[PDB]
Design a protein around this ligand. Structure first.
Ligand SMILES: [Cl-]
Ligand SMILES: [Cl-]
Ligand code: NA
Length: 129
C-alpha cells in the first residue's frame, strides 16, 4: 500500500510512534518518505547482500529473516515479508526496537542525511491526527 502523508502520520500515531524515544511524529514520517516514498511493499538490495523491507526499509542483516542473508540476525523475530503488509504493526514494532538500540534514528541513514536537523514538523502540517 502507498500511504498518503497524513494517512501515514495518523497510523503511526495510532501505532505509538509519536514521540517514541523522543522522536516527534514528523521524524518518522520524514524517514518513511525518503526510505520508501510511503510504500509498504518497497524492497531494496544492499551491496552487502542484505535487503531492506517496507515503509521504514528495515534491514535483513540484523532485524528480520529473509532466508538469504548470510550470517545475520533476526532481532525483531519476524519474517522480512511481514514488513511489507498494508498494516504497519510489524514495521512499527520492529522500528521501536531499532530506535531503542543506542543510536536513535541515525540507524536510518536517510533520516540522518535528509531529515535530521530539518523542519520535520512540516511533514505533519495540515494533518488531522
Ligand atoms: Cl538469512
Ligand atoms: Cl536519541
Ligand atoms: Na536476517
Amino acid at each position: 500500500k502507498v500511504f498518503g502523508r497524513c494517512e501515514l502520520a495518523a497510523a503511526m500515531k495510532r501505532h505509538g510512534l509519536d514521540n517514541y524515544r523522543g522522536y516527534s511524529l514528523g521524524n518518522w514520517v520524514c524517514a518513511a518518505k525518503f526510505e520508501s516514498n510511503f510504500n509498504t511493499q518497497a524492497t531494496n538490495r544492499n551491496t552487502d547482500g542484505s535487503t531492506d523491507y517496507g515503509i521504514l526499509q528495515i534491514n535483513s542483516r540484523w532485524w528480520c529473516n529473509d532466508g538469504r542473508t548470510p550470517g545475520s540476525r533476526n532481532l525483531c523475530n519476524i519474517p522480512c515479508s511481514a514488513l511489507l503488509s498494508s498494516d504497519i504493526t510489524a514495521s512499527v514494532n520492529c522500528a521501536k526496537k531499532i530506535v531503542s538500540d543506542g543510536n536513535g534514528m541515525n540507524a536510518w541513514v536517510a533520516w540522518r542525511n535528509r531529515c535530521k536537523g530539518t523542519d520535520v514538523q512540516a511533514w505533519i502540517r495540515g494533518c488531522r491526527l
